Design a protein around this ligand. Structure first.
Ligand code: PLP
Ligand code: PLP
Ligand code: NBG
Ligand code: NBG
Lengths: 817, 817
């Protein structure tokens, strides 16, 4: 039992064992003779859950009594992962439960592996929302996460014949012990219908009604007894009209068709940085917004002058997905509360804040007018009015600038009329932020330049972060322990204290412990790999890892080119020494993203060749990590030596995986993109492996005109690789299998893979040179870990609180349980 | 607190209050400040449930140890109603819980009204299965009820403008504390596909797979610590093929289409005594049978010579709904276990028993061959083989009788080929029974005459019954108490002891108590009527009740004719004295049964006229009891004076509502149909109000030819009624509203309403004459209650056990909890 895992004191262990047996009997209705590992997992989950309830109830009672300003984080994604260990960590019950289960003859770590991941997110955006919820609770903010309870989260990825196969993530199959259904708080949501203009105001009538049933999940802060709530809405059909609309096609059919309204919360769209304008997605977006706003207003009216609304409520929009909150708030205030437009607008603007997460054009939401027209007629009218008044403001500030007017319009003209949701968000929010310094600057200099010129005060930066609880203490206890031994435990909730480790960079003892922990993590992971999936990696090789969603801008393809280069160099000089490497690439491709699926096949195709070449031996291995998800991230990241963050400069808004690797003892090879810039700034550029074009360089190349052929003609090693791909060297039975990839690299590569190839290969050689010197590699690692403090989501949330929401974070512990 | 409700002893009450608060806090996550009545209901339900778990686990462990013969009751319907009070009654916790909640400042009776009915049945057939489960547990049989967990049970009936409106019964909305999901025991069910004949046997391949997930509900016996199980299957789509069948229409659509396989357990077909040959119904029937048989075999292989199978297993088929169990058992034994046909057939016949519940032709299941052909190709082949071998047996016993062969064939020739499931059941079962003596005789003399001649030994009778726990102790505690005061509590599990009450028929004290209880029940119900539904009945009037499903054979129309007769007689002689009556009619009509819906409208239309006629006053009231269901039956039956059981002789197989009224102190007016015959036999015909044609009389009339016109021409009062209906007297704004009803009564009444009119009216006059003499009315009531013992489902189950299943019932209490 390690120090940071809490105390396992007599009374506690005895009490836990007692309650464990209680739940196994009464809750699961089983006895020790027929109980399976899953039964034991659930008995433990219910036992831990019990310790959470008391504090959950008083935290909420507390907010009712003190009535502080409330923060509502709206997101269509919350990538939570597993909850058991995280709950134990935050409640300081890990060692007690470990002992209690040990005495019951059970291995707690094998029980934890039974829990299903709550994968209600695609990647970075969804996981950021999860880290934020943790930090808001740890900082004592009266915050509520609001989203959708998808019955099917991100699909489980299977690799068959080297190809990605998708299968439904039935995560609720065995039940979810963490959520609490609150059917009593069900709210109605309206769709379709038409607008009627009456004597006093407009009325939205003849609508289809769908019920929103909330499920609450507790979010515990770190050892402060604060337990906030994440409320997820589930779609339910009403019992009437969805059957009472008589004169029709039969009783049975009417009941079966209920699964037409309930499909709204059925599944998560599996896209990462890609907009898909489907009606079902729009319905989901309005569903979460409509239900949430009614809940917010209801809670407020308990706290009718809405002038104080902005003082008691803050609504944060995670991307444009929940952008309809702006016109919906206006609708309720104008149509239902009967406030004058101007007054309602003032309240709305002061209440909403918008966070932008990307500059990629194919990721921006632009909804066709005909869709909004049919599904939400009243909102479309409100949007037109907002646009009209906004453009009048622009025209007054920039007289005669007619092109500026069309550029800033919320309504985009063309083949099909569309509403630019990003423009909607900027107009209706008092604050707009990017997620990394370089991203926020790009927003002001390019994409939102016109808006910045009109309202410079709205634009801000809030560099992303990750929670040190899940991403250090939970997944890397070994490291957290050796750190605690030197500087105490205070850093867990004050990551900046990791800087104290700088005075240990020359400590022979510490250097040895740091390296020891990494080695243990690698052996641990190397074992998991065989135990599950039967694979052959060598724990002595350099663990080169690139895990994140598969996307062309992420450039998994550049990594592939390097891997093939290494392979060719070995075959050319077989008996020459090279630092052994285990290259691991993992990530999911969106089901309808062809090129992404082709990239996965190439990676496995390369492994098929490299992993079975006698001459290579155990000097180079290429493994594709199947079903990359939060729980897998918690295993591979602590075991990594090299972190690949190689997106084309200017494409990765921030990145968060980069921060996770830095905190866990891996060195980083990457481009000056997103948060990589600030990470290098914090650690010192001489302690980072930076390469490739900077944003300025990419722009030059575009002015010039990118011609991949040039690089192909002047770089022999690159030419060889392309010829191997084209000739079928990696696909014997299908010679032209990778023709699309080659065609893209050569004629229409929007991300300039070839442009950074030479610089990349050279930088990688420097990485291999340092790995040869264990002591110096580890000292550089220490300098990275020691300067990763700025990337704690606690820092990020404290900035949102003070600069956007107008609330003060607190580390004060709540009056016990 | 009344005696029969158990003890409320210090330690128990203290413990219950403690656990109540425990669940309210930890389970519901609420505190006394925000808890609603529903929250309190759930805290109490979980508290009572806890006392059930211990015994449930040891009962099952007990069956595993002693390995007795097991009884499997297969039914597509289980009309359970509410579970809270029933559980308390059977565990002897009613007074303790009453006191415990009282001390917590809560009214337990108002909490009980919050529980939703588990309406997984249509009427008599489904409720019989529920009473049987109770009796099997009370008699210590190792029995399991197997059915389907419909997410939508029988629709909730609303009356709008006098018409029936249907709305979805979302009974699981707030959760079900009584069931326990057992996802670990999920089993696959196959559909479609094709048959392949290989070297060694036939193979069913290329099928669609649907998963069957079981949910277990505890069934406690009466104070014997026995807790049996009712396992209900829920449909689940697999995560693969229902997504892995690549090369198709999109990821999102594939996930949404999962609600194509899961629709199997979505809703209960709302038909009572009416066959609807839809594919979805056939899928439900096979779904329950396939999942159940695999579960049975699996449990057996734990108990490979299947020769002992019939000694360890008994399968009871409730009607033909689960008839596919016969060919499915053969399929598994022949195709999977590789037993020779003859051996497999011997086992199947000795294992299965069939109970027939009706002789109405439109209720008999006859599935089109093309349906079975496409959905279950292997089963169709097995059915043909069974038929072939059965007909060879018939041909050998009755040489040259070619018409007998076509009459007995399982395959029905004609416009469309169909399989007669009843013939299938008789051929593949070792016992076939009717549900009342007269019904069982009709089966042998008519419908199944040919089969009886071939195998006389298979035909039996098992008169239906009702459980005295729910239908006396639970719904009429007042009566159970005054009975217990005189003869003890032993009768609750030995109803025959009620005969001792015969020696109290002249007891002035008892006569007074009996009448007092009825009066209290009527006041109680008269109040409920106003509290809910705002209505005006008078507690001093005779409560004339007819509650059951609306159907032409049940003759609610004959009752209507009498009601109109009374009304007309009053209008003719306003100032003449007549015994005051409150006529109550209630019941649901199947959504697609036009005539049934028209009958409901007529009843309310009559009330509209009669209830607002100044001259009538409070002498006659016509009320339509909305949403008749089990919970409503528990309220109205104890309050009834007159029970209407007036089906056309030979149409009501047994009836069970008739038994409920008899046990609760109501006199009966009825035809010699179903169990009415045996009830009159037991009580003495001079203590029953019998009228109308007997079965023999109906047959004569059919030989003759039924001509309604004759009765219309010779009965002035009847003529007047028909003319009032035709002229629009009961539908002013729609003069011909009831044209269909009149047309039917006059030209195509299959149930001869007019033929029994005169006899009915006269009998009703005799009922009014006796009601005028309180003392004599009550003495006759006592003679009915005292002779209702034979109708306890404990008697019924004991007979099934000894004469069909080959097992001995036991009243021995299980070794405590
Ligand atoms: C942290 C995380 C991400 C984000 O990784 P990036 O490299 O920033 O894209 C994606 N998926 C999972 C499961 C994560 O844990
Ligand atoms: C007992 C019962 C029935 C059966 O009544 P019959 O008059 O035999 O048709 C039908 N419905 C409910 C809810 C019952 O309690
Ligand atoms: C649309 C979307 O998911 N954008 C992503 O948001 C996360 C969290 O801010 C960033 O780290 C990532 O670089 C950016 O691509
Ligand atoms: C098909 C069907 O529901 N038949 C019914 O079965 C119940 C229970 O046996 C009988 O009481 C009733 O008279 C009979 O009509």
């Amino acid at each position: 039992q390690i120090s940071v895992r809490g105390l396992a004191g007599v009374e506690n262990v005895t009490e836990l064992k007692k309650n464990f047996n209680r739940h196994l009997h009464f809750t699961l209705v089983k006895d020790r003779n027929v109980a399976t590992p899953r039964d034991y997992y659930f008995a433990l989950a219910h036992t831990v859950r019990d310790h959470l309830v008391g504090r959950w109830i008083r935290t909420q009672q507390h907010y009712y009594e003190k009535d502080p300003k409330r923060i509502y984080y709206l997101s269509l994604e919350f990538y939570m992962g597993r909850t058991l260990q995280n709950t134990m960590v935050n409640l300081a019950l890990e060692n007690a439960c470990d002992e209690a289960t040990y005495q019951l003859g059970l291995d707690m770590e094998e029980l934890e592996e039974i829990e299903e991941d709550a994968g209600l997110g695609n990647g970075g955006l969804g996981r950021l929302a999860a880290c934020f919820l943790d930090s808001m609770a740890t900082l004592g903010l009266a915050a509520y996460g609001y989203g959708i309870r998808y019955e099917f989260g991100i699909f489980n990825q299977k690799i068959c014949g080297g190809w990605q196969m998708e299968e439904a993530d039935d995560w609720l199959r065995y039940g979810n012990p963490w959520e609490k259904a609150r059917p009593e708080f069900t709210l109605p949501v309206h769709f379709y219908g038409r607008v009627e203009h009456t004597s006093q105001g407009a009325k939205w009538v003849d609508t289809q009604v769908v019920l929103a049933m909330p499920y609450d999940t507790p979010v515990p802060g770190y050892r402060n007894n604060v337990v906030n709530t994440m409320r997820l809405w589930s779609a339910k059909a009403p019992n009437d009209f969805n059957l009472k609309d008589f004169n029709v096609g039969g009783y049975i059919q009417a009941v079966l068709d209920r699964n037409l309204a309930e499909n709204i919360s059925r599944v998560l769209y599996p896209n990462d940085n890609f907009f898909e304008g489907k009606e079902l997605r729009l319905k989901q977006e309005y569903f979460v917004v409509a239900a949430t706003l009614q809940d917010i207003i209801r809670r407020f009216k308990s706290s009718t002058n809405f002038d104080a609304f902005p003082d008691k409520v803050a609504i944060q929009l995670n991307d444009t997905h929940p952008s309809l909150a702006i016109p919906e708030l206006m609708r309720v205030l104008v149509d239902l509360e009967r406030l004058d437009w101007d007054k309602a607008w003032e309240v709305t603007v002061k209440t909403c804040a918008y966070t932008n997460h990307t500059v990629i054009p194919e990721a921006l939401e632009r909804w066709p007018v005909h869709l909004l027209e049919t599904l939400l007629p009243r909102h479309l009218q409100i949007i037109y009015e907002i646009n009209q008044r906004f453009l009048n403001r622009v025209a007054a500030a920039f007289p005669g600038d007619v092109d500026r007017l069309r550029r800033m319009s919320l309504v985009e003209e063309g083949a099909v009329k569309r509403i630019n949701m990003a423009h909607l968000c900027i107009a209706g929010s008092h604050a707009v932020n990017g997620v990394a310094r370089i991203h926020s600057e790009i927003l002001k200099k390019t994409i939102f330049k016109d808006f910045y010129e009109l309202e410079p005060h709205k634009f801000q930066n809030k560099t992303n972060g990750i929670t040190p609880r899940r991403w250090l203490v939970l997944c890397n206890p070994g490291l957290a322990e050796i750190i605690a031994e030197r500087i105490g435990e205070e850093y867990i909730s004050d990551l900046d204290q990791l800087r104290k480790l700088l005075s240990y960079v020359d400590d022979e003892a510490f250097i040895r412990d740091v390296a020891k922990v990494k080695q243990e993590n690698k052996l641990k992971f190397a074992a998991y790999l065989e135990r599950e999936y039967k694979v052959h990696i060598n724990p002595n090789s350099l663990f080169d890892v690139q895990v994140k969603r598969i996307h062309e801008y992420k450039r998994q393809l550049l990594n592939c080119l390097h891997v093939i280069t290494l392979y060719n160099r070995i075959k050319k000089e077989p008996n020459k020494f090279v630092v052994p490497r285990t290259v691991m690439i993992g990530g999911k491709a969106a089901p309808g993203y062809h090129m992404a699926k082709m990239i996965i096949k190439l990676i496995t195709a390369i492994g098929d060749v490299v992993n079975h070449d006698p001459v290579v031996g155990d000097r180079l291995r290429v493994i594709f990590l199947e079903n990359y998800r939060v729980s897998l991230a918690e295993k591979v990241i602590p075991a990594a030596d090299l972190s690949e963050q190689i997106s084309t400069a200017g494409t990765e808004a921030s990145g968060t995986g980069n921060m996770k690797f830095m905190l866990n003892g891996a060195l980083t090879i990457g481009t000056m993109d997103g948060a990589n810039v600030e990470m290098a700034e914090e650690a010192g550029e001489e302690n980072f492996f930076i390469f490739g074009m900077r944003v300025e360089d990419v722009d030059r190349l575009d002015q010039r005109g990118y011609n991949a052929q040039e690089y192909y003609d002047r770089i022999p090693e690159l030419r060889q690789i392309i010829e191997q791909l084209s000739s079928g060297f990696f696909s014997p039975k299908q010679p032209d299998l990778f023709k699309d990839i080659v065609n893209m690299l050569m004629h229409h590569d929007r991300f300039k893979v070839f442009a950074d190839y030479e610089e990349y290969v050279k930088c990688q050689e420097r990485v291999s040179a340092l790995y040869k010197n264990p002591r110096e590699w580890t000292r550089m690692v220490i300098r990275n870990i020691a300067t990763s403090g700025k990337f704690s989501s606690d820092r990020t949330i404290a900035q949102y609180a003070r600069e956007i929401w107008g609330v003060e974070p607190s580390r004060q512990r709540l009056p016990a349980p």
